Amino acid sequence: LTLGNTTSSVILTNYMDTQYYGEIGIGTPPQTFKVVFDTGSSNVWVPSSKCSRLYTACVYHKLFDASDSSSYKHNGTELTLRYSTGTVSGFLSQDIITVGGITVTQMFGEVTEMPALPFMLAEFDGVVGMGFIEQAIGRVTPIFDNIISQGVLKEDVFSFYYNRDSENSQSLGGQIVLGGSDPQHYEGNFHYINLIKTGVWQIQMKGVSVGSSTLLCEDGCLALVDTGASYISGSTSSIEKLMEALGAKKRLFDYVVKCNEGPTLPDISFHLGGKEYTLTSADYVFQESYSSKKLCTLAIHAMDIPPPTGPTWALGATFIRKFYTEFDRRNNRIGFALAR
Numbered sequence: 187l188t189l190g191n192t193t194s195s196v197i198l199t200n201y202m203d204t205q206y207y208g209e210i211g212i213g214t215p216p217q218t219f220k221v222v223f224d225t226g227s228s229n230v231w232v233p234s235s236k237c238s239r240l241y242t243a244c245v246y247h248k249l250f251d252a253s254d255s256s257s258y259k260h261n262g263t264e265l266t267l268r269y270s271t272g273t274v275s276g277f278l279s280q281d282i283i284t285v286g287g288i289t290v291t292q293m294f295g296e297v298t299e300m301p302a303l304p305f306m307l308a309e310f311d312g313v314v315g316m317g318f319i320e321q322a323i324g325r326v327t328p329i330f331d332n333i334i335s336q337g338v339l340k341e342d343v344f345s346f347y348y349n350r351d352s353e354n355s356q357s358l359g360g361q362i363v364l365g366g367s368d369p370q371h372y373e374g375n376f377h378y379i380n381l382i383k384t385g386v387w388q389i390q391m392k393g394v395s396v397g398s399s400t401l402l403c404e405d406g407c408l409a410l411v412d413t414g415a416s417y418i419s420g421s422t423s424s425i426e427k428l429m430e431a432l433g434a435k436k437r438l439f440d441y442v443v444k445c446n447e448g449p450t451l452p453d454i455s456f457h458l459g460g461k462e463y464t465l466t467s468a469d470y471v472f473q474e475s476y477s478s479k480k481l482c483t484l485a486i487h488a489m490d491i492p493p494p495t496g497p498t499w500a501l502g503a504t505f506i507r508k509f510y511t512e513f514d515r516r517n518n519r520i521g522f523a524l525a526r
C-alpha cells in the first residue's frame with residue numbers, strides 16, 4: 187500500500203430515485219459515458235461502436251469507438267457479465283479512464299450485445315464495478331485497485347451519498363468520494379460492520395423487524411451492500427412474508443399497496459453490528475398519490491441471488507439514501523452514518 191494526500195469526488199445524477207450515475211472519460215481525446223458505480227460487480231464496461239444497431243439499446247447509448255482513441259490498446263478477449271436484471275457480452279480493451287480528477291490506465295469491456303430489457307430503460311450507458319478482484323470476470327484488475335496502486339488517495343476507502351430526487355435542477359443527485367468521506371453529507375458517527383470475507387461487500391445481518399415483531403431472518407442471514415441496485419431485496423420466501431405483514435399485492439417484478447395505505451405502513455429495521463437501521467414508510471414507498479384508486483410501488487422487491495454470493499438480502503439505493511456508506515478496503519469493513 188501507499189497513501190498520498192488526494193481525495194476526488196464524482197458528482198452523480200439521480201433519475202427517479204432508481205438510477206444514480208456519473209460521468210467518466212475513456213480514450214484520447216476523452217469519449218464521455220454515464221456509468222453506475224456498483225459495489226455488487228467488479229468489471230468496467232461501456233457499449234461499443236462494434237455493437238450491431240439491431241441491438242436497439244446500442245442505438246440509444248454512447249458507444250466507445252476505439253478507432254478515435256490514440257491511447258487504445260487491443261486485447262480482444264471475450265467476456266459475459268451477468269447482472270441481477272440482465273446480461274451483457276463483448277470483449278476486453280485497454281485505454282485511459284478519467285474519473286473525478288484521476289487518470290488511470292484500465293482494462294474494460296466493450297459491450298457488443300446489450301438486450302433491450304433492461305438496457306433500453308437505462309439512463310446510464312455502462313458500469314464501473316467497485317467490487318473486489320475476486321469477483322472480476324476475466325480476473326481483470328478493478329478500477330479502484332488500479333487507483334490505489336498510484337498511491338495518491340489519502341485512504342484506501344470510498345463513500346456513497348445518494349440524495350432524494352428533486353423537482354429542481356440545483357439538487358445534487360449524489361456524490362462518490364474516492365479516498366475519503368464528506369462530512370457535509372452525514373452526521374453523528376460511523377458505525378462499522380466487518381465483511382464476512384474480503385472479496386465481497388457483504389456483511390452479517392442479525393435480524394429484520396416489521397414493527398415490534400422480529401418476524402424475519404430470525405437466526406441470521408447475509409446483507410450485500412449494493413450501490414448498483416435500485417431497491418432493498420431479499421429472497422422470494424423472505425419477501426412474500428414481508429409483503430404479507432405490509433398487506434401488499436404481488437405484481438410481475440414489484441410489490442404495490444393502495445396509495446392511501448402507504449403512509450400508515452410500519453417501520454422496517456435491519457439489525458447490523460450493534461445498531462438498528464430503521465426505514466419509515468416515507469423511506470420505502472413511492473408515495474406518488476394518496477388515492478385509494480391508484481397503486482403505489484414499494485422500493486423493496488424480491489431477488490434470489492445465486493451462490494456463492496447468495497442467498498442474501500441486498501441493501502441498495504433505498505437504504506443508502508438514509509445511510510451515508512463508507513467502503514473500507516484497508517480494514518475490510520463498511521461504515522454507516524445518517525445522511526444529510
Ligand SMILES: *[C@@H]1O[C@H](CO)[C@@H](O)[C@H](O)[C@H]1NC(C)=O
Pocket residue numbers: 260261262263278
Ligand atoms: C489480454 O490481457 C491479459 C491481462 O494482462 C493478458 O495477460 C492477455 O495475454 C491479453 N491478450 C491479448 C491478445 O492482448
